[PDB]
mmCIF file of C-alpha atoms in Angstrom:
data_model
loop_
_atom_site.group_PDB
_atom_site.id
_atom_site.type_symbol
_atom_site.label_atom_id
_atom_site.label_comp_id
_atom_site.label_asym_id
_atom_site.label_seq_id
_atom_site.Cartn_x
_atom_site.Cartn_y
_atom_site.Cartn_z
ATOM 1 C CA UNK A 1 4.396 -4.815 15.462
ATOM 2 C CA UNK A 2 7.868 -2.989 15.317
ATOM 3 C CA UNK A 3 6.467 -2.140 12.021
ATOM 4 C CA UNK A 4 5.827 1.089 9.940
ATOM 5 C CA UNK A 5 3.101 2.029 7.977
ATOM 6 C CA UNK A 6 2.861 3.882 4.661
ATOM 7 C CA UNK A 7 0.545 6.428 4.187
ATOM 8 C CA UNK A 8 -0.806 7.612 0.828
ATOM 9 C CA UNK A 9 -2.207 11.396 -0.709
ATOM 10 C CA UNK A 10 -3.275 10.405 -3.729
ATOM 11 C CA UNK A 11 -3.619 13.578 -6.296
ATOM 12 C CA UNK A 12 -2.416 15.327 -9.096
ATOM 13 C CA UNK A 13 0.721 17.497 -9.755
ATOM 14 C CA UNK A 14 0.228 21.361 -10.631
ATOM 15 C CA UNK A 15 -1.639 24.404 -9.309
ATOM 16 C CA UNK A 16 -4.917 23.429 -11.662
ATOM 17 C CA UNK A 17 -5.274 20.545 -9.666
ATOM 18 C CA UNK A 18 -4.542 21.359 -6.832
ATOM 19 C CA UNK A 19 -8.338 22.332 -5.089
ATOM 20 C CA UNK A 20 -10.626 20.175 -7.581
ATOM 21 C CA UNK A 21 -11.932 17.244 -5.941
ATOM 22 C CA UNK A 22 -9.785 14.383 -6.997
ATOM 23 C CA UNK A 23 -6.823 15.896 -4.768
ATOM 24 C CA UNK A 24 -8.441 15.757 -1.083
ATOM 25 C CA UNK A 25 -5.703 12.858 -0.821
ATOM 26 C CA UNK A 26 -2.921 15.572 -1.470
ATOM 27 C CA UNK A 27 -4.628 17.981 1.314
ATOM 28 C CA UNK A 28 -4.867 15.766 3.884
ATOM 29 C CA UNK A 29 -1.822 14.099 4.024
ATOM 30 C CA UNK A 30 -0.369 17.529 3.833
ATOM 31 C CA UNK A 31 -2.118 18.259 7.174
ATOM 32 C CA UNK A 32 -1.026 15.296 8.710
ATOM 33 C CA UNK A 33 2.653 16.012 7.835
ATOM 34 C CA UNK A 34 2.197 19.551 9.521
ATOM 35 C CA UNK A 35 0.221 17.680 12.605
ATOM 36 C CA UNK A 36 3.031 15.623 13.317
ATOM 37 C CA UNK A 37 5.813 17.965 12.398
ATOM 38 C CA UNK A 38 6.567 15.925 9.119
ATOM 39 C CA UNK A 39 8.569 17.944 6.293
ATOM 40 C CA UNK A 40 8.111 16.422 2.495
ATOM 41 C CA UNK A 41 11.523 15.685 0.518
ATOM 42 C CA UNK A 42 11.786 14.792 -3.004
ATOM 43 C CA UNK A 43 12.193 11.011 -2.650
ATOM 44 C CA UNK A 44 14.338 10.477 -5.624
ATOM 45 C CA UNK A 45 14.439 6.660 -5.358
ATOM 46 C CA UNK A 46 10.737 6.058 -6.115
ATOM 47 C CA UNK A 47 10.313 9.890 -8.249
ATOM 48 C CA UNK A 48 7.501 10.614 -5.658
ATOM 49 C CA UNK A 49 8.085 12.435 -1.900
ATOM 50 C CA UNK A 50 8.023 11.264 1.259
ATOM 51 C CA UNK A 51 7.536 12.724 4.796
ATOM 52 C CA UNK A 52 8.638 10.989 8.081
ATOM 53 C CA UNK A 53 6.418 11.048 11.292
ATOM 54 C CA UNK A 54 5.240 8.939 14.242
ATOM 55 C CA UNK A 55 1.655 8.626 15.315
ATOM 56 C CA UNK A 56 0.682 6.690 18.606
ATOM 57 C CA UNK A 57 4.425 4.969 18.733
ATOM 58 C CA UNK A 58 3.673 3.103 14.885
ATOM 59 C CA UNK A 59 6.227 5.221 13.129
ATOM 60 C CA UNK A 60 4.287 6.188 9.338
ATOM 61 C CA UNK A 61 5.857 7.461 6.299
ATOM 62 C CA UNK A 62 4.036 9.858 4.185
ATOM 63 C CA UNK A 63 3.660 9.759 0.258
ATOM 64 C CA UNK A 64 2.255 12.196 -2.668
ATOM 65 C CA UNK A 65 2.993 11.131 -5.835
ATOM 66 C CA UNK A 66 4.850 13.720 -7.704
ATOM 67 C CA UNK A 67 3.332 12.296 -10.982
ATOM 68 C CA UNK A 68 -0.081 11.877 -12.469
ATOM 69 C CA UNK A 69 -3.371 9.859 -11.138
ATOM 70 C CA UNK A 70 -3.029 7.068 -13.400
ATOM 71 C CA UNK A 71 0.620 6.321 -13.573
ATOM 72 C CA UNK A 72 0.596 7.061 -9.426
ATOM 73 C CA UNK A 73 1.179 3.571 -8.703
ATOM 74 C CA UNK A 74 4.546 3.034 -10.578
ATOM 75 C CA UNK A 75 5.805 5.389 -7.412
ATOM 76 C CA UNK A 76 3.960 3.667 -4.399
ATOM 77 C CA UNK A 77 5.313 -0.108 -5.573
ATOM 78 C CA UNK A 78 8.444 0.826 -5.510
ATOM 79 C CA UNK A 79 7.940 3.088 -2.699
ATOM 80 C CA UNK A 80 6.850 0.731 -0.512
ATOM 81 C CA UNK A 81 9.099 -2.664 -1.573
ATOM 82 C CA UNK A 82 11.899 -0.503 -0.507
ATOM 83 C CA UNK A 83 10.034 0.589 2.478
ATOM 84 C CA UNK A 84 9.483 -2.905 3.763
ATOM 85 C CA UNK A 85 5.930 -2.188 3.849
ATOM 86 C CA UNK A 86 3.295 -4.994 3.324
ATOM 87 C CA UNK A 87 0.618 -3.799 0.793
ATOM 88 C CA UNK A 88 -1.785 -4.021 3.623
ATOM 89 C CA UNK A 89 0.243 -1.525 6.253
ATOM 90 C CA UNK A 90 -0.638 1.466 3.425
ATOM 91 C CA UNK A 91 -2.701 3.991 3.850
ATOM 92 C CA UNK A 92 -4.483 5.406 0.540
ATOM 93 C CA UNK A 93 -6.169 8.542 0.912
ATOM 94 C CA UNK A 94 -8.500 9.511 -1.474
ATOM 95 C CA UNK A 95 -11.760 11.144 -2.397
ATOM 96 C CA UNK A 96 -15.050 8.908 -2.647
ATOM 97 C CA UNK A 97 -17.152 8.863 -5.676
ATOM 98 C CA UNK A 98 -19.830 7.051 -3.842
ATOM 99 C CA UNK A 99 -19.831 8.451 -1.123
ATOM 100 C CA UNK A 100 -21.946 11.301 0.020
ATOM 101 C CA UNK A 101 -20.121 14.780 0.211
ATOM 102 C CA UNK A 102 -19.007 15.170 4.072
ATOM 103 C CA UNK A 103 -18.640 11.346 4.346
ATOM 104 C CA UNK A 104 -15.755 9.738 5.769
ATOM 105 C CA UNK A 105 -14.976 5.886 6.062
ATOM 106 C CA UNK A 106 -12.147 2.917 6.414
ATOM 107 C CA UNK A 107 -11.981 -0.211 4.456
ATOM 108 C CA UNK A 108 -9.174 -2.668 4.017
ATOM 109 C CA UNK A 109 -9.422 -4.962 0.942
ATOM 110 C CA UNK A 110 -12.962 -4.069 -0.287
ATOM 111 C CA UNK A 111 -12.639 -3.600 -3.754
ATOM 112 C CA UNK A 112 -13.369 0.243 -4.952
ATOM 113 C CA UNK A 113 -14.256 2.505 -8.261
ATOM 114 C CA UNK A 114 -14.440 5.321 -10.094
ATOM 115 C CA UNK A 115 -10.519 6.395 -9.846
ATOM 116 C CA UNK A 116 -7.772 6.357 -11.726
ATOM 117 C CA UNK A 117 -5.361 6.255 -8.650
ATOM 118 C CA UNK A 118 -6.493 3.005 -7.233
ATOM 119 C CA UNK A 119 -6.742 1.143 -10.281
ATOM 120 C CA UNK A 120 -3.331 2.259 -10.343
ATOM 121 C CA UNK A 121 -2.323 1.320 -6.914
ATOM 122 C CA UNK A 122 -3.426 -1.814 -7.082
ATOM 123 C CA UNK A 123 -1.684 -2.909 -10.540
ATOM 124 C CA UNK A 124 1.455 -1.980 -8.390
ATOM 125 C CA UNK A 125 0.688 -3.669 -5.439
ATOM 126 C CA UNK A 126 -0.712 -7.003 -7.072
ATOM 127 C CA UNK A 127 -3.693 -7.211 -4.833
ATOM 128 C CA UNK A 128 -6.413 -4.867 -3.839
ATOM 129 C CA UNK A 129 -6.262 -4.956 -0.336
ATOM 130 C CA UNK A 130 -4.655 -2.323 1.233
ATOM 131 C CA UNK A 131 -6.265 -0.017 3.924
ATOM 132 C CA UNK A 132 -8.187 3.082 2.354
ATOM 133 C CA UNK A 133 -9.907 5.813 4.043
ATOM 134 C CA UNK A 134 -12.636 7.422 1.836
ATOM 135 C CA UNK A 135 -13.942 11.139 1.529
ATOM 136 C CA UNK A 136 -16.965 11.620 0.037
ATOM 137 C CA UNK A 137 -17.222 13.300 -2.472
ATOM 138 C CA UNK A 138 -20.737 13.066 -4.282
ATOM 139 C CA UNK A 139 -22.300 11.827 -7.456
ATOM 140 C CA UNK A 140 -21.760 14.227 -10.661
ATOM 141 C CA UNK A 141 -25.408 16.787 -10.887
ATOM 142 C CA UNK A 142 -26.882 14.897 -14.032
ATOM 143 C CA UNK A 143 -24.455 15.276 -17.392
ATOM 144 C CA UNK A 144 -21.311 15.774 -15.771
ATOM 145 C CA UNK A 145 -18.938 13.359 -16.547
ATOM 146 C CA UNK A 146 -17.682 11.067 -13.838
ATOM 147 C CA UNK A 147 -14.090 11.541 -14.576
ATOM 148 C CA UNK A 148 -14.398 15.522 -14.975
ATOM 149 C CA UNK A 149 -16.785 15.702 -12.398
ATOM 150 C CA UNK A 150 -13.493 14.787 -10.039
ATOM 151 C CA UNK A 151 -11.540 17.472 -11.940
ATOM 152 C CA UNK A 152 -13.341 20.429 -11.047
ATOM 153 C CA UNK A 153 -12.787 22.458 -7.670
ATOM 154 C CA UNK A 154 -15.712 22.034 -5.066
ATOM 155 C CA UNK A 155 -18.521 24.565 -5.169
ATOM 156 C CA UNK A 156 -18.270 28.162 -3.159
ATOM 157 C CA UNK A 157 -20.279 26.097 -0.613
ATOM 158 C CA UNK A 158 -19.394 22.237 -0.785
ATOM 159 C CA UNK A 159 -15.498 24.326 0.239
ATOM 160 C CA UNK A 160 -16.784 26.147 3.433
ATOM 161 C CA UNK A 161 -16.934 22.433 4.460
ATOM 162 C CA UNK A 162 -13.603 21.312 2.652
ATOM 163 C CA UNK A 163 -11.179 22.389 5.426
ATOM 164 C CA UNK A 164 -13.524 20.871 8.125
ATOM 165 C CA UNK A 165 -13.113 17.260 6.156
ATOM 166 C CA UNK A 166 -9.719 17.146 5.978
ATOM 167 C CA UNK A 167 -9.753 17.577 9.135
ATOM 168 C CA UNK A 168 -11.873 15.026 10.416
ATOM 169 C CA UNK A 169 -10.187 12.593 7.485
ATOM 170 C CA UNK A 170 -6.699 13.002 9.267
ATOM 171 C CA UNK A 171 -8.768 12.059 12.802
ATOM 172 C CA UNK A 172 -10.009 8.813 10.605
ATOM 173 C CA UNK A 173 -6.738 8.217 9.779
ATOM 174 C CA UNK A 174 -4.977 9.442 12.893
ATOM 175 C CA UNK A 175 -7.398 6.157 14.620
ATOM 176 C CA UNK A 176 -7.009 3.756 11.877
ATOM 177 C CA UNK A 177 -3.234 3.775 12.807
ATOM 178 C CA UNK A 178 -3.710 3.320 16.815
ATOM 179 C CA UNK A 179 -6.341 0.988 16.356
ATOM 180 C CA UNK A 180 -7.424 -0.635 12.669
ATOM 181 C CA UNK A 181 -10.789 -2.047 12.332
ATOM 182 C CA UNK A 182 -11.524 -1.996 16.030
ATOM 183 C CA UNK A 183 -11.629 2.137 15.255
ATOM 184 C CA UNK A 184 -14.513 2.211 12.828
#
C-alpha cells in the first residue's frame, strides 16, 4: 500500500462562487491543505492545482479544479493518470443534494446525482466508482431550481453551521484515508 491517494475539492472558479453551496468541496480541501501544512501550486500539466501532504503515513495529493463544474473532469483524468492513481484511491469532495443540511457520509462506487462535477468526474475516469465523501446540503424550499438552488450562498443561519461542517468533513475524510470502509 506504498500508494498515494488523490483527493478532490470539487467547485467553481471566481469570488461569486466561492460561498454558494456547490463549492463546500473547494472549502474543505482548502482546510485540509492548511491542516497538514499543504501549499496549492498551479499544476500546469493537468490546468488545475495541486497541494502535497501526508495523512496517517498514506501520502495524498490535493486537487481544485481551476476550471468550471462541468468541464472539472477533463483536469482530474489527466490529473490522476499522471499521478498513478487508480480511480478508486480519489477522494471527491462535494456537497450532497440529498442529503440533509449538516450531514456527512462516505461511499465508494455508489452511483450519485444532482451535480455537474461528478457526472463530470466520472466521464473522465470511465467508471463511477471512486471514493466520495458527501455534505449535505438540503433539498431546494419548493420552486427553486435544483441547479440554482446549489448556486446560491447558504442562509445567514444554515452558515453559522458552515465552518463547523467543513470541519467535521475533513475528520470524515481525515478517517476515510487511515481506515476506508472500516471508518464509517
Amino acid at each position: 500500500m506504498a500508494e498515494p491517494l488523490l483527493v478532490v475539492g470539487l467547485g467553481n472558479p471566481g469570488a461569486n462562487y466561492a460561498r454558494t453551496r456547490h463549492n463546500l468541496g473547494f472549502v474543505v480541501a482548502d482546510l485540509l491543505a492548511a491542516r497538514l501544512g499543504a501549499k496549492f501550486k498551479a499544476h500546469k500539466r493537468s490546468g488545475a492545482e495541486v497541494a502535497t501532504g501526508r495523512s496517517a503515513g498514506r501520502s495524498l495529493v490535493l486537487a481544485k479544479p481551476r476550471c468550471y463544474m462541468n468541464e472539472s473532469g477533463r483536469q482530474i483524468g489527466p490529473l490522476a493518470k499522471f499521478y498513478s492513481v487508480a480511480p478508486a484511491n480519489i477522494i471527491v469532495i462535494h456537497d450532497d443534494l440529498d442529503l440533509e443540511f449538516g450531514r456527512i457520509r462516505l461511499k465508494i462506487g455508489g452511483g450519485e446525482g444532482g451535480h455537474n462535477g461528478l457526472r463530470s468526474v466520472v466521464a473522465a475516469l470511465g467508471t463511477k466508482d471512486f471514493q466520495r465523501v458527501r455534505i449535505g446540503i438540503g433539498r431546494p424550499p419548493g420552486r427553486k431550481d435544483p441547479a440554482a438552488f446549489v448556486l446560491e450562498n447558504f442562509t445567514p443561519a444554515e452558515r453559522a453551521e458552515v465552518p463547523t461542517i467543513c470541519e467535521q468533513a475533513a475528520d470524515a475524510t481525515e478517517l476515510l484515508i487511515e481506515q476506508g470502509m472500516e471508518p464509517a
